Structure 1
Amino acid sequence: AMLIKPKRLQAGDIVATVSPSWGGAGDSEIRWRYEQGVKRLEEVFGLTVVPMPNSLKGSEFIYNNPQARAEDLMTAFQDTRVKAIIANIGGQDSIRLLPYIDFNAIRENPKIFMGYADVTISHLFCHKAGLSSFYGPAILTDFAENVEMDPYTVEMVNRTLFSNEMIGEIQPAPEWTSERLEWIEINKDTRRTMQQNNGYELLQGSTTVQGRLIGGCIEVLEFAKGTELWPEKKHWEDSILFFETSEDHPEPSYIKYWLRNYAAQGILQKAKGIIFGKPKDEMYYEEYKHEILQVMKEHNLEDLPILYNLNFGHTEPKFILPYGSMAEIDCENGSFSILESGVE
């Protein structure tokens, strides 16, 4: 282990909400959605929520003030009352925060940080500071789910952030959705239609392997390549890579190119295994498979275990991936597990 595992959460703890990417949470027509997400944090998990100063000032201000976003993060980390930090939503430009990050402030204040998509960049901030962050649900997409939170997501939050015992095997969700239901309050009493889930798919591999988790949104990780934010070499040794595709539905060819680059970096050659999240709307589901298996064939990595269609990324519900945690891919059973606690 080379990342600090933060302290477990419990009822009464204060959680901070932040907008390091898109600042729509503060927009007039969206605010209701944010408040809905806060409600579940307070009622289902018994937590106290506090928005950081600049977090709800709207999308226009947020976009024009990357420094203000950084200040919000630093404030949350440097406040010892804050036991956890949760992103409101992803976006596309959180990379602009890099010049304003005091990594030492993160290093000196280990605590839970969670989010996904463009929040991958913020996870890399933590990662560089030697802090294990959590690739998981955000306020507006998961906690603010209309009518009721998904029991699957709730369970995984409990198991990951409220328990210092081994997470164990991650079962596949029974249902999933990526249906677009506009975030206007007129729809708050409307449930999203669910789709039956078929489970995980083993694309290749014939062995049981263990490695430490690293990765995120495959599109956003590209933003950090070549930068000082990219993880040091040792973080890629004996790893379990995890990738998920965003809502832009990246064309299959780009997956191929991006994976080719991971081979050019020597990353795929060091991996113990790889896991892929369900594509949003299951778009390019079969096409991505082709591109992935092709790259492995190109670099003689056809024995590398790859698990597909996992419940993380841009579909609901989702489980949580702690960065740096020991994970397992059992090819014989086609199962996936996390072999330790997410928190102390």
Structure 2
Amino acid sequence: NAMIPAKLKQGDEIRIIAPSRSIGIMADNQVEIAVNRLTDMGFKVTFGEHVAEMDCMMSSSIRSRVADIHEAFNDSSVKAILTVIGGFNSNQLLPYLDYDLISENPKILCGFADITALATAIYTQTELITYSGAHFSSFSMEKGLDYVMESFSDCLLQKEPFALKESATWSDDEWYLDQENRNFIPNEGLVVMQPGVAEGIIIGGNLCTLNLLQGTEYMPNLAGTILFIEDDFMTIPETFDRDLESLLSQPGADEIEGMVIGRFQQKTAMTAEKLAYIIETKTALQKIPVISGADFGHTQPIATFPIGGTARIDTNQTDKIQIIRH
């Protein structure tokens, strides 16, 4: 069964790697804040040897990112690994990873969006539980951050079940470019789209990214899972639909226990009607409960949750999402 890596504790070292886009797209100023932020939380922050390498795709070579990953896992002082930022190409690295090395060195790996690929592949090949959550760059956000740290802390510094609470406010701002002028919005809350109750193994993160593992070794079976699914502003409802239909045609999809969907960005123009239409036409979702408007995805603020950890959904309760194993 699944390996829960040791929770972080004060003084632990945290390694920053860039398996997707280069730390070079972050301004010197942003780096400083995130460093200090995690340092104030009580951690030695260190950086992979190649984080700053940059090519024409704003990323770096396969061999470089692979090495930073292996070093990070092989270094025993490192208790958690944080990705710099997402991007597009972490799926390139999958064939080249020493999964024996990784399973021999269980520890936290956390990041989201493109990192879904890497994180999911490591769970499926290794059974190490990984995390969909804050990037390193996530901690460079001056306003609204409290929720991020609280969920990051609930998930990674403590071990008891916790609830994926609804934020009080949420936003959809390009905050790295403008940090003072933000637009927090009262969170109208989660939205029950299909009622029910269930319990299961957590799979998901970024939908179009998880699609990429379909037909590979690295794809997890979906039997007995709660799906936590999200996508960014590039997806429109029609692309979300086709990408979801694809996911729900994969092995184990007949036996999905439920789904939680993260808040969409504004440009996606997802509406309640469209989302309802999309879900209502999916066969594998017919009986199980489904929620939308959760605090993970590309809006602020994000939670941090385990891929390969367990959850319970109860639509009648106030706190609808409970994380149990994590």
TM (normalized to structure 2)? 0.93
Percent sequence identity over aligned pairs: 26
Q: What do you get for the CA RMSD once the two structures are aligned?
A: 2.0
Q: Find the partner of 2:294 among 303, 310, 317.
A: 310
Q: Does 1:294 align with 2:280?
A: yes
Report if the CA contact (8 A) 2:94-2:118 is conserved. no
Equivalent AA in structure 2 for residue 193 of structure 1: N
Report if the CA contact (8 A) 2:207-2:230 is conserved. yes
Aligned counterparts of 1:126 and 1:301: Cα–Cα separation in 2: 27
Greater mean alpha carbon deviation, residues 7-16 or residues 119-128 = 119-128
Shift of residue 269 of structure 1? 1.7
Q: Does 1:195 align with 2:185?
A: yes
Task: Return closer, same or farther for 1:77/1:257 CA change in 2, 3 Å cut-off.
Answer: same
Shift of residue 170 of structure 1? 2.0
Task: Return closer, same or farther for 1:326/1:61 CA change in 2, 3 Å cut-off.
Answer: closer
Q: Could you say which residue in structure 1 is the equivalent of 2:247?
A: 262
Q: Could you say which residue in structure 2 is the equivalent of 1:18?
A: 17
Report if the CA contact (8 A) 1:143-1:149 is conserved. no
Q: Does 1:130 align with 2:127?
A: yes
Report if the CA contact (8 A) 2:261-2:292 is conserved. yes
Aligned counterparts of 1:85 and 1:135: Cα–Cα separation in 2: 12
Q: Does 1:174 align with 2:168?
A: yes
Shift of residue 81 of structure 1? 0.5
Shift of residue 288 of structure 1? 4.6
Map 1:1-344; keep pairs closer than 5 Å.
Answer: 2-23=1-22, 25-27=23-25, 30-43=27-40, 45-58=41-54, 60=56, 63-127=59-123, 128-140=125-137, 142-146=138-142, 148=143, 150-167=145-162, 169-183=163-177, 187=178, 190-205=180-195, 207-231=196-220, 233=221, 236-248=222-234, 250-281=235-266, 283-286=268-271, 288-296=274-282, 299=283, 301-333=285-317, 335-342=319-326
Report if the CA contact (8 A) 2:3-2:128 is conserved. yes
Equivalent AA in structure 2 for residue 285 of structure 1: M
Aligned counterparts of 1:341 and 1:130: Cα–Cα separation in 2: 14
Aligned counterparts of 1:35 and 1:59: Cα–Cα separation in 2: 23
Deviations 1:282-301 (A, max 9, x none): 733316513432333xx274
Report if the CA contact (8 A) 2:211-2:247 is conserved. no
Report if the CA contact (8 A) 1:202-1:334 is conserved. no
Aligned counterparts of 2:52 and 2:144: Cα–Cα separation in 1: 23
Report if the CA contact (8 A) 2:91-2:117 is conserved. yes
Shift of residue 125 of structure 1? 2.9
SS of the counterpart of 2:72? helix
Task: Return closer, same or farther for 1:267/1:253 CA change in 2, 3 Å cut-off.
Answer: farther
SS of the counterpart of 2:128? coil
TM (normalized to structure 1)? 0.88
Deviations 1:246-288 (A, max 9, x none): 231x122222222222332254321110000001227333165
Deviations 1:135-157 (A, max 9, x none): 001122x20003x5511111111
SS of the counterpart of 1:84? strand
Report if the CA contact (8 A) 1:201-1:334 is conserved. no
Aligned counterparts of 1:149 and 1:70: Cα–Cα separation in 2: 33
Q: Which runs of 4+ in 1 moved over 4 A?
A: 59-62
Aligned counterparts of 1:53 and 1:32: Cα–Cα separation in 2: 20
Report if the CA contact (8 A) 2:228-2:261 is conserved. yes
- Unpaired runs of 5+ residues, structure 2, are none
Aligned counterparts of 1:292 and 1:339: Cα–Cα separation in 2: 26
Task: Return closer, same or farther for 1:53/1:200 CA change in 2, 3 Å cut-off.
Answer: same
Task: Return closer, same or farther for 1:263/1:181 CA change in 2, 3 Å cut-off.
Answer: closer
Greater mean alpha carbon deviation, residues 319-328 or residues 88-97 = 319-328
Greater mean alpha carbon deviation, residues 117-126 or residues 266-275 = 266-275
Aligned counterparts of 2:57 and 2:11: Cα–Cα separation in 1: 32
Report if the CA contact (8 A) 1:17-1:49 is conserved. yes
Shift of residue 60 of structure 1? 4.2
Report if the CA contact (8 A) 2:13-2:77 is conserved. yes
Report if the CA contact (8 A) 1:179-1:281 is conserved. no
Aligned counterparts of 2:6 and 2:55: Cα–Cα separation in 1: 32
Greater mean alpha carbon deviation, residues 284-293 or residues 14-23 = 284-293
